[PDB]
């Protein structure tokens, strides 16, 4: 017999940088609601950004990657691979990743698209770290990108003010100390219909002049699942990384709803002075992009500092969750 | 001052089994279209089309069941599932949690990976990487495809190529290393070579225009695969510390027989190396093609468990992913 060779990579892996792209167009509650107080009270959202018509999930991802590279002090030549996590790449094929790689001037590098609803970022982060420690790569881009605005039913009074557009990217590479803890993840396939495209594209393709697909949300069900189950997920993620709740400096949950996230902060028993991501206020829910965008906002404003111990929790569609403890990038 | 735990799982990981699902309905060249014309160009004689109530997700579930059974394991033994596909026709929810739920392991981690036909290679790599990192001990990786609804029956360039099916592998700890290092890359400059021609949203906003279909720039894909994947193969063998002459089984993506015939020669394998030819009765099932081709070779007994196999996935995005594995089941 011949033994199949095993390779090895870096032991200590971390977030070198974050780079964010936010579309120019600002849509206020008052503009979209044709009550600002009503929306803000229920969601925590005041405004959100909508991408232009010529912008796409891939194009915003590219801009975000450019910015992440600059913040890590790297060129595209330094990158070994790129994972795009998104739910709004509106082509079955080709994937976004190779297009992103090409736009960045690194056309040959490995990459794929990963879809796990709002939790794809934690999954892609975990995969990158695993890949780098495995020896399959040394430095990687992970980019959450989302163009949700064309998917919104503007007569759906349950969700139309929730979803928004944007992209943010992290660079994952070797660090002097461990910077990304073990990935804690799971799902609940039994509640798959809680967040969905209501009509599959093929059913629609065969009757284009009938009702078209839009995003649908069973809000109460999602609220209850997130608010009550994600505490245990955070604890698992902290326990795996060997850290206590009181050691957490920064909490970055998925920016789905402020009320959900306030309940999680309380459930997680964090320090009274722990810094909690609240990017949703002017960014809305940008799904796969929300955590890294929220990371960027905290670093941009000086609320968080690079090296801060952060707990990230992603939750959402499919009913999927992914969580991990990290050190803040940049 | 605050340590983030450094961990690890099993260093030696491998394929414990493969399970295949193929739809009942056999469509012949004669039914679809000239038998000799298609066969000369592609090596396809027949292909399988899934029923209307079948999906990529449902077929993935069935492929997983069989894989589990072939490994002598149940859903309880699995820590996660990766579904790779290009024909999950929902933006959300992802297929993976639905497959987990249908297996009776609704709580397990999982996600959808899309990378054209190279998705299996990437997902295999990712699954092994995850296990060695300690994030899981045993995983399912399933390639699945319902390609028939995407075919334009008037596209005389490709209508006879694509078909339906699913196959899954169980990935877990093995006594000896069973999955070589991932060799992967892409060429985004040739993104339009294999594509959905009209994006779903553009189509939704103009229902009076044409509907989307799979489009293929054959020549451009042929050239790229036939002359570039040889080197990819060599890089994957080199990474696994194996010579071409040690390869028992070669499993390229079942895109086209003629491409694959040129690849076999370029790769300089043993005259008696076994070459996957599942395309003949399965057609091109994209992401499902490689595990399906593995299962076909094991079923006929052309390949045996333990055999040293070279896998090369190539296709859309212009993406490729390759590794050397030991044959499972
Ligand atoms: C996080 O859980 O958010 C999920 C949002 C993804 C919705 C995808 C859009 C589906 C509708 C397509 C018209
Ligand atoms: C392997 O390279 O396969 C790529 C083919 C995937 C085709 C997806 C279908 C796109 C058309 C949707 C109507």
XYZ file of C-alpha atoms and ligand atoms in Angstrom:
685
model
C 0.000 0.000 0.000
C 0.954 3.657 -0.560
C 0.087 6.066 2.243
C -1.708 9.215 1.051
C 0.296 12.297 2.070
C -1.103 14.694 4.641
C -0.293 18.381 4.594
C -0.268 20.887 7.477
C -0.788 24.640 7.789
C -0.784 27.392 10.418
C -1.813 26.525 13.982
C -2.839 30.039 14.988
C -5.321 31.692 12.654
C -7.159 35.020 12.922
C -9.074 37.851 11.294
C -6.454 40.178 9.841
C -8.908 42.789 8.578
C -12.465 43.717 7.760
C -13.569 45.821 4.798
C -17.127 47.009 4.229
C -19.102 48.258 1.252
C -22.398 50.063 1.760
C -24.484 51.243 -1.263
C -24.953 55.016 -1.676
C -28.767 55.083 -1.594
C -30.213 55.666 1.895
C -33.846 54.549 2.326
C -35.475 56.056 5.445
C -38.417 54.447 7.260
C -40.498 57.439 6.160
C -39.559 56.918 2.502
C -40.129 53.150 2.566
C -43.396 53.550 4.482
C -45.524 54.967 1.655
C -44.544 54.977 10.478
C -40.883 55.566 11.361
C -41.583 55.159 15.105
C -43.517 51.922 14.462
C -40.662 50.296 12.463
C -37.897 51.475 14.807
C -39.692 50.277 17.961
C -40.290 46.788 16.522
C -36.958 46.291 14.700
C -34.380 48.890 15.768
C -34.107 50.079 12.152
C -34.208 53.766 11.192
C -32.669 53.565 7.695
C -31.218 50.983 5.287
C -29.123 51.026 2.098
C -30.323 49.809 -1.296
C -27.875 48.895 -4.067
C -28.155 50.501 -7.511
C -29.717 48.625 -10.445
C -26.294 47.947 -12.035
C -24.935 46.570 -8.741
C -25.059 42.878 -7.809
C -24.146 40.532 -4.943
C -20.805 39.749 -6.658
C -19.905 43.404 -7.487
C -20.403 44.626 -3.903
C -18.465 41.567 -2.670
C -15.576 42.615 -4.903
C -15.568 46.155 -3.506
C -15.694 44.777 0.043
C -12.760 42.446 -0.712
C -10.694 45.363 -2.092
C -11.247 47.198 1.191
C -10.470 44.154 3.376
C -7.213 43.677 1.461
C -6.185 47.295 2.031
C -6.939 47.037 5.775
C -4.859 43.837 6.029
C -2.097 45.557 4.053
C -2.266 42.995 1.241
C -2.702 42.815 -2.521
C -4.802 40.196 -4.348
C -1.554 38.316 -5.109
C -1.288 37.511 -1.370
C -4.621 35.675 -1.403
C -4.901 31.895 -1.885
C -8.701 31.613 -1.958
C -12.063 33.317 -1.612
C -15.379 32.146 -0.178
C -18.503 34.108 -1.103
C -21.409 33.615 1.265
C -24.713 34.972 -0.035
C -28.398 34.207 -0.567
C -28.944 36.658 -3.400
C -26.700 35.450 -6.209
C -29.469 35.260 -8.824
C -27.807 32.682 -11.076
C -27.784 28.911 -10.531
C -24.369 29.106 -12.217
C -21.661 30.455 -12.615
C -20.744 30.986 -8.938
C -19.819 34.457 -7.617
C -16.413 33.496 -6.138
C -14.487 33.094 -9.450
C -15.984 36.343 -10.801
C -14.936 38.126 -7.598
C -11.450 36.565 -7.872
C -11.143 37.769 -11.489
C -12.364 41.328 -10.749
C -9.727 41.526 -7.979
C -7.007 40.516 -10.475
C -6.475 37.079 -8.914
C -8.438 35.068 -11.541
C -6.739 31.713 -10.874
C -7.318 31.363 -7.133
C -9.591 28.702 -5.619
C -13.075 29.556 -4.392
C -16.744 28.688 -4.068
C -20.123 30.066 -2.964
C -21.586 28.988 0.381
C -25.278 29.337 1.281
C -26.579 28.768 4.808
C -28.950 31.691 5.073
C -27.827 34.356 7.509
C -25.381 31.883 9.124
C -23.224 31.314 6.018
C -20.617 33.768 7.316
C -19.828 31.710 10.427
C -19.784 28.576 8.263
C -17.472 30.212 5.683
C -15.226 31.677 8.402
C -14.960 28.199 9.972
C -14.258 26.586 6.580
C -11.508 29.114 5.772
C -9.796 28.663 9.162
C -10.043 24.852 8.719
C -8.639 25.114 5.187
C -5.682 27.245 6.299
C -4.855 25.007 9.276
C -5.194 22.048 6.889
C -2.504 23.501 4.617
C -4.891 23.972 1.674
C -4.328 27.737 1.807
C -2.352 30.324 3.802
C -4.457 33.475 3.393
C -8.138 33.677 2.471
C -10.937 36.153 1.837
C -14.372 35.447 3.294
C -17.098 37.732 1.987
C -20.739 38.046 3.002
C -22.715 39.851 0.323
C -26.408 40.495 -0.174
C -28.739 42.254 -2.610
C -32.094 41.677 -0.911
C -33.965 44.765 -2.188
C -35.180 43.101 -5.444
C -36.504 40.155 -3.383
C -38.778 42.291 -1.162
C -42.557 42.343 -1.574
C -43.236 46.007 -0.814
C -46.851 45.169 0.129
C -45.699 42.593 2.711
C -46.223 44.519 5.949
C -44.401 41.827 7.932
C -40.923 42.205 6.370
C -40.545 44.898 3.674
C -38.757 47.302 6.072
C -36.371 44.603 7.391
C -34.127 43.559 4.472
C -31.325 45.622 2.877
C -28.169 45.522 0.725
C -24.418 45.481 1.423
C -21.186 43.505 1.566
C -18.297 43.063 3.981
C -15.190 40.917 3.769
C -12.601 39.582 6.205
C -9.064 38.406 5.553
C -8.225 35.184 7.391
C -4.523 34.366 7.866
C -1.767 33.265 10.228
C -1.513 35.239 13.470
C 0.948 35.252 16.424
C -1.856 33.930 18.650
C -5.040 31.891 18.207
C -7.668 34.305 16.893
C -10.551 32.081 15.785
C -12.063 29.501 18.133
C -13.897 26.287 17.189
C -16.999 26.580 15.014
C -20.255 25.817 16.797
C -23.092 25.154 14.378
C -26.361 23.301 13.812
C -29.793 23.712 12.246
C -33.531 23.089 12.440
C -34.724 21.782 9.074
C -38.208 21.267 10.521
C -38.792 25.036 10.513
C -37.432 25.600 6.974
C -40.538 27.531 5.889
C -40.008 30.244 8.535
C -37.754 32.147 6.102
C -38.175 31.287 2.417
C -38.545 32.156 -1.219
C -42.276 31.321 -1.517
C -42.222 30.120 -5.154
C -39.271 28.094 -6.500
C -37.758 29.543 -9.707
C -38.684 26.566 -11.932
C -42.374 26.580 -10.947
C -42.245 30.320 -11.638
C -40.357 29.904 -14.970
C -43.224 27.761 -16.252
C -45.780 30.505 -15.454
C -43.868 33.858 -15.562
C -47.002 36.021 -15.964
C -48.512 34.677 -12.743
C -47.387 35.621 -9.213
C -43.616 36.135 -8.894
C -41.399 34.934 -5.992
C -40.679 37.153 -2.992
C -39.044 36.645 0.394
C -41.518 35.551 3.052
C -40.979 35.561 6.813
C -42.884 33.994 9.718
C -41.691 36.636 12.203
C -43.096 35.364 15.535
C -41.653 31.879 14.844
C -38.180 33.275 14.009
C -38.265 35.657 16.984
C -38.996 32.782 19.390
C -36.393 30.434 17.895
C -33.605 33.039 17.886
C -34.417 34.696 21.229
C -34.692 31.401 23.127
C -32.222 29.002 21.431
C -29.209 31.151 20.532
C -28.090 31.710 24.122
C -27.177 28.027 24.343
C -25.341 28.349 21.028
C -23.256 31.288 22.291
C -22.383 29.370 25.465
C -21.260 26.376 23.391
C -19.099 28.693 21.250
C -17.527 30.244 24.353
C -17.017 26.868 26.039
C -15.304 25.496 22.907
C -12.948 28.498 22.807
C -12.306 28.115 26.557
C -13.647 31.573 27.482
C -16.123 32.856 30.097
C -19.072 35.127 29.175
C -17.518 37.883 31.359
C -14.406 37.745 29.151
C -16.364 38.782 26.033
C -15.583 42.355 24.978
C -17.767 42.557 21.867
C -20.991 40.789 20.905
C -21.761 40.597 17.170
C -25.025 38.717 16.602
C -26.747 38.615 13.233
C -28.473 41.981 12.747
C -31.959 40.481 12.293
C -33.811 42.500 14.955
C -32.655 44.675 17.898
C -35.228 43.182 20.295
C -34.045 39.625 19.619
C -30.458 40.741 20.125
C -31.166 42.569 23.413
C -32.729 39.363 24.755
C -29.624 37.402 23.696
C -27.305 39.922 25.420
C -29.278 39.376 28.624
C -29.447 35.574 28.224
C -25.691 35.346 27.572
C -24.881 37.047 30.911
C -22.304 39.426 29.433
C -20.467 42.174 31.319
C -22.612 45.299 31.753
C -19.983 47.179 29.692
C -19.807 44.621 26.845
C -20.069 46.281 23.438
C -23.043 45.066 21.390
C -23.219 45.452 17.603
C -26.155 47.651 16.579
C -25.387 48.222 12.872
C -28.983 47.316 12.000
C -30.007 50.908 12.894
C -28.706 52.330 9.599
C -27.936 49.099 7.705
C -31.020 46.932 8.266
C -30.900 43.141 7.962
C -28.326 42.294 5.287
C -28.324 38.533 5.966
C -24.940 36.860 5.172
C -23.298 40.306 5.134
C -24.623 41.496 8.518
C -21.989 40.190 10.953
C -18.901 41.444 9.061
C -20.698 44.733 8.268
C -21.532 45.037 11.970
C -17.885 44.258 12.780
C -16.748 47.043 10.447
C -19.193 49.573 11.957
C -17.914 48.906 15.491
C -14.302 49.319 14.359
C -15.065 52.418 12.214
C -16.672 54.289 15.158
C -14.106 53.178 17.751
C -16.694 51.305 19.832
C -14.581 48.186 19.346
C -10.804 47.852 19.041
C -8.705 45.314 17.090
C -7.826 42.368 19.344
C -11.051 42.677 21.367
C -12.548 39.293 22.259
C -15.719 38.949 20.190
C -18.585 36.487 20.131
C -20.212 36.138 16.728
C -23.585 34.382 16.344
C -25.301 33.848 13.008
C -28.888 32.646 12.836
C -31.616 32.637 10.181
C -32.797 30.889 7.008
C -33.121 27.105 6.601
C -33.081 27.601 10.267
C -29.297 27.466 10.411
C -26.913 28.740 13.052
C -23.145 29.201 13.216
C -21.120 30.748 16.025
C -17.523 31.247 17.095
C -15.320 33.352 19.368
C -12.811 35.606 17.564
C -10.441 38.540 18.065
C -11.620 41.717 16.332
C -9.785 42.379 13.047
C -7.830 45.359 11.593
C -4.075 37.892 27.973
C -7.103 35.738 27.064
C -6.375 32.441 25.311
C -8.599 31.181 22.505
C -8.440 27.367 22.626
C -6.325 25.541 20.032
C -7.912 22.171 19.148
C -7.734 19.217 16.755
C -9.656 16.163 15.518
C -8.625 12.966 13.723
C -5.660 13.533 11.384
C -6.470 10.500 9.214
C -9.802 10.911 7.424
C -11.362 8.987 4.532
C -14.393 7.915 2.533
C -16.329 5.295 4.489
C -18.976 4.748 1.775
C -20.737 6.004 -1.324
C -24.496 5.848 -1.970
C -26.184 6.672 -5.265
C -29.673 7.650 -6.304
C -30.719 7.665 -9.959
C -34.279 8.498 -11.169
C -36.357 5.645 -12.663
C -37.010 7.196 -16.085
C -34.430 6.310 -18.724
C -34.350 8.723 -21.665
C -32.577 7.414 -24.769
C -30.762 9.481 -27.421
C -33.429 8.287 -29.852
C -36.219 9.537 -27.531
C -34.487 12.838 -26.652
C -33.401 13.623 -30.227
C -29.529 10.521 -33.710
C -28.060 7.937 -31.318
C -24.709 7.722 -33.150
C -24.479 11.541 -33.500
C -24.814 12.246 -29.755
C -22.657 9.252 -28.803
C -19.837 10.244 -31.186
C -19.755 13.745 -29.687
C -20.335 12.972 -25.988
C -20.178 9.232 -25.240
C -23.758 9.418 -23.901
C -26.169 6.613 -24.864
C -28.934 7.201 -22.280
C -29.613 9.505 -19.295
C -32.006 9.665 -16.317
C -34.653 12.337 -15.716
C -36.280 12.889 -12.317
C -40.064 12.991 -11.807
C -41.844 16.337 -11.441
C -42.352 15.923 -7.678
C -38.611 15.252 -7.228
C -36.052 17.899 -6.333
C -32.307 18.255 -5.828
C -32.981 18.092 -2.073
C -35.197 14.978 -2.177
C -32.658 13.110 -4.333
C -29.850 14.213 -1.987
C -31.779 12.727 0.955
C -32.144 9.361 -0.794
C -28.457 9.326 -1.798
C -27.579 10.014 1.860
C -29.764 7.152 3.157
C -27.960 4.699 0.880
C -24.522 6.060 1.807
C -25.373 5.624 5.512
C -26.589 2.068 4.891
C -23.441 1.299 2.864
C -21.290 2.583 5.739
C -23.296 0.551 8.277
C -24.236 3.816 10.020
C -27.440 5.681 10.836
C -28.308 9.404 10.764
C -27.370 9.537 14.469
C -23.702 8.908 13.622
C -23.464 12.037 11.434
C -22.313 15.419 12.772
C -23.030 17.369 9.584
C -24.013 17.361 5.927
C -22.700 19.395 3.011
C -24.998 19.583 -0.028
C -23.318 20.677 -3.241
C -25.599 21.548 -6.135
C -26.329 24.042 -8.909
C -30.040 23.238 -9.172
C -31.543 24.065 -5.788
C -34.167 26.416 -7.234
C -34.672 28.487 -4.069
C -32.495 31.414 -2.944
C -33.445 30.284 0.564
C -33.886 28.116 2.611
C -30.738 26.081 1.828
C -31.136 22.392 0.942
C -28.831 21.018 3.674
C -31.100 21.517 6.756
C -34.031 20.050 4.801
C -31.969 16.947 3.949
C -30.876 16.640 7.595
C -34.501 16.864 8.749
C -35.636 14.237 6.203
C -32.945 11.864 7.492
C -34.132 12.297 11.093
C -31.111 14.330 12.176
C -32.701 17.807 11.911
C -30.311 19.446 14.404
C -26.983 18.742 12.689
C -24.839 21.457 11.072
C -24.873 21.928 7.299
C -24.748 24.224 4.287
C -25.023 24.391 0.489
C -21.808 24.728 -1.532
C -21.977 25.969 -5.129
C -18.908 25.793 -7.399
C -20.217 24.410 -10.671
C -19.171 20.824 -11.232
C -16.152 21.266 -8.930
C -18.392 21.655 -5.859
C -17.908 18.018 -4.842
C -14.105 18.383 -4.756
C -14.404 21.528 -2.624
C -17.043 20.029 -0.312
C -14.991 16.849 0.148
C -11.972 18.986 1.056
C -14.039 21.150 3.410
C -15.533 18.111 5.146
C -12.130 16.498 5.773
C -10.680 19.879 6.865
C -13.541 20.248 9.337
C -13.007 16.769 10.809
C -9.228 17.244 11.210
C -9.878 20.616 12.858
C -12.212 18.837 15.284
C -15.467 20.543 14.232
C -17.029 17.156 13.380
C -16.110 13.465 13.461
C -18.255 11.973 10.694
C -19.900 13.844 7.825
C -22.060 13.448 4.736
C -21.119 15.119 1.463
C -23.742 14.870 -1.248
C -23.688 16.097 -4.816
C -27.156 16.399 -6.276
C -28.635 17.778 -9.454
C -32.020 18.181 -11.119
C -30.791 19.521 -14.466
C -33.642 18.512 -16.820
C -35.875 21.600 -16.125
C -32.956 23.875 -17.131
C -32.498 22.351 -20.580
C -33.572 24.253 -23.679
C -34.742 21.419 -25.959
C -33.940 23.638 -28.983
C -30.370 24.308 -27.825
C -28.746 21.780 -30.171
C -25.438 22.559 -28.422
C -26.246 20.944 -25.061
C -29.792 19.547 -24.677
C -28.504 15.952 -24.910
C -25.798 16.470 -22.288
C -27.431 17.190 -18.917
C -29.310 14.793 -16.631
C -30.489 14.079 -13.071
C -29.270 12.133 -10.027
C -27.509 12.297 -6.678
C -24.708 10.526 -4.854
C -23.365 10.987 -1.343
C -20.245 9.944 0.540
C -19.719 9.358 4.248
C -16.477 10.989 5.393
C -14.947 9.863 8.697
C -11.857 8.716 10.581
C -9.928 5.889 8.926
C -6.884 3.884 10.146
C -4.799 5.388 7.287
C -5.093 8.673 5.349
C -7.864 8.297 2.778
C -8.283 11.790 1.301
C -5.314 13.634 -0.218
C -4.790 17.415 -0.122
C -7.218 19.562 -2.106
C -5.875 21.022 -5.323
C -8.229 23.717 -6.569
C -8.472 26.941 -8.535
C -10.547 28.759 -11.110
C -10.637 31.010 -14.164
C -13.215 33.769 -13.643
C -12.320 35.422 -16.967
C -14.210 32.588 -18.687
C -17.321 32.848 -16.452
C -19.744 32.994 -19.395
C -18.502 29.640 -20.743
C -21.105 27.738 -18.651
C -24.050 29.788 -17.403
C -27.648 30.580 -16.700
C -28.117 33.134 -19.516
C -30.638 35.414 -17.780
C -30.504 36.066 -14.036
C -33.679 35.210 -12.096
C -34.472 38.789 -11.045
C -34.066 40.279 -14.539
C -36.407 37.494 -15.712
C -38.935 38.155 -12.900
C -39.136 41.860 -13.852
C -39.600 41.047 -17.556
C -41.928 37.993 -17.826
C -42.660 38.799 -21.499
C -38.987 38.319 -22.409
C -37.289 34.945 -22.743
C -37.018 32.576 -19.772
C -33.576 31.491 -18.518
C -31.819 28.314 -19.677
C -28.409 26.704 -19.234
C -26.036 27.897 -21.973
C -22.689 26.335 -22.814
C -19.768 27.559 -24.919
C -18.678 24.017 -25.836
C -15.389 24.747 -27.688
C -14.142 27.077 -24.905
C -14.964 24.499 -22.192
C -13.477 21.607 -24.214
C -10.166 23.403 -24.772
C -9.859 24.424 -21.109
C -10.701 21.018 -19.616
C -8.775 18.833 -22.074
C -5.512 20.808 -21.931
C -5.500 22.257 -18.367
C -6.824 19.472 -16.119
C -3.808 17.272 -16.874
C -1.626 19.679 -14.878
C -4.325 19.888 -12.179
C -4.249 16.077 -11.982
C -0.452 16.148 -11.657
C -0.618 18.743 -8.861
C -3.144 16.595 -6.950
C -1.037 13.432 -7.295
C 2.076 15.377 -6.230
C 0.250 16.740 -3.149
C -0.824 13.231 -2.088
C 2.716 11.923 -2.641
C 1.708 9.471 -5.362
C 3.071 8.829 -8.851
C 0.750 8.655 -11.882
C 1.585 4.905 -12.181
C 0.175 4.268 -8.685
C -3.314 5.465 -9.694
C -5.785 2.567 -10.052
C -8.907 4.579 -10.836
C -9.452 7.907 -12.565
C -12.720 9.750 -11.908
C -12.969 12.973 -13.903
C -16.177 14.997 -13.975
C -18.432 13.295 -16.535
C -18.757 16.365 -18.763
C -17.868 14.669 -22.047
C -16.236 11.314 -22.910
C -13.923 12.816 -25.499
C -12.554 15.471 -23.142
C -11.984 12.715 -20.605
C -10.284 10.480 -23.184
C -7.788 13.255 -23.920
C -7.277 13.755 -20.165
C -6.509 10.061 -19.596
C -3.734 10.159 -22.221
C -2.265 13.444 -20.935
C -2.207 12.081 -17.368
C 0.080 9.170 -18.404
C -1.530 6.539 -16.167
C -1.036 2.754 -16.300
C -2.436 1.179 -19.479
C -4.693 -0.815 -17.117
C -5.966 2.165 -15.091
C -9.759 2.081 -14.686
C -11.485 5.139 -16.155
C -14.929 6.276 -14.981
C -17.364 6.197 -17.908
C -20.708 6.620 -16.072
C -21.670 9.394 -18.564
C -22.728 6.641 -21.013
C -25.915 5.860 -19.095
C -26.034 8.777 -16.643
C -25.070 11.755 -18.805
C -23.661 14.901 -17.236
C -25.043 15.356 -13.716
C -22.631 18.220 -12.841
C -22.024 18.233 -9.045
C -23.359 14.691 -8.618
C -21.222 13.246 -11.438
C -18.084 12.231 -9.522
C -19.691 10.424 -6.561
C -22.111 8.830 -9.084
C -19.150 7.747 -11.231
C -17.464 6.289 -8.110
C -20.620 4.356 -7.201
C -20.970 3.057 -10.793
C -17.380 1.707 -10.813
C -17.874 0.017 -7.448
C -21.221 -1.495 -8.555
C -19.714 -3.041 -11.729
C -16.643 -4.153 -9.766
C -14.323 -2.282 -12.133
C -13.107 -0.467 -9.002
C -12.579 -2.046 -5.572
C -12.634 -0.568 -2.049
C -9.137 0.671 -1.191
C -8.244 1.446 -4.821
C -6.230 4.611 -5.333
C -8.457 7.061 -7.218
C -7.756 10.435 -8.786
C -10.777 12.752 -8.791
C -10.901 15.868 -10.986
C -13.900 18.206 -10.914
C -14.052 20.919 -13.579
C -16.751 23.191 -14.983
C -18.780 26.352 -14.313
C -17.485 29.635 -12.907
C -14.612 27.968 -14.573
C -13.678 26.201 -11.363
C -11.694 23.053 -10.714
C -11.041 20.890 -7.652
C -9.045 17.682 -7.425
C -7.722 15.180 -4.893
C -6.460 11.625 -4.589
C -8.700 9.383 -2.497
C -9.001 5.730 -1.530
C -12.144 4.148 -2.971
C -14.848 3.655 -0.326
C -17.921 1.444 0.293
C -31.274 35.467 7.065
O -31.770 34.512 7.632
O -31.975 36.050 5.931
C -32.395 35.245 4.830
C -32.800 36.154 3.680
C -32.598 35.450 2.347
C -33.802 35.656 1.441
C -33.471 35.276 0.002
C -34.468 35.897 -0.968
C -35.555 34.910 -1.378
C -36.636 35.569 -2.231
C -36.323 35.515 -3.725
C -37.309 36.328 -4.543
C -20.907 21.680 -14.157
O -20.013 22.379 -14.607
O -22.288 22.102 -14.328
C -22.631 23.452 -14.617
C -24.053 23.474 -15.156
C -25.033 23.984 -14.107
C -26.271 24.531 -14.801
C -27.225 25.198 -13.819
C -28.538 25.549 -14.509
C -28.558 27.005 -14.976
C -29.831 27.317 -15.752
C -30.999 27.668 -14.834
C -32.290 27.774 -15.622
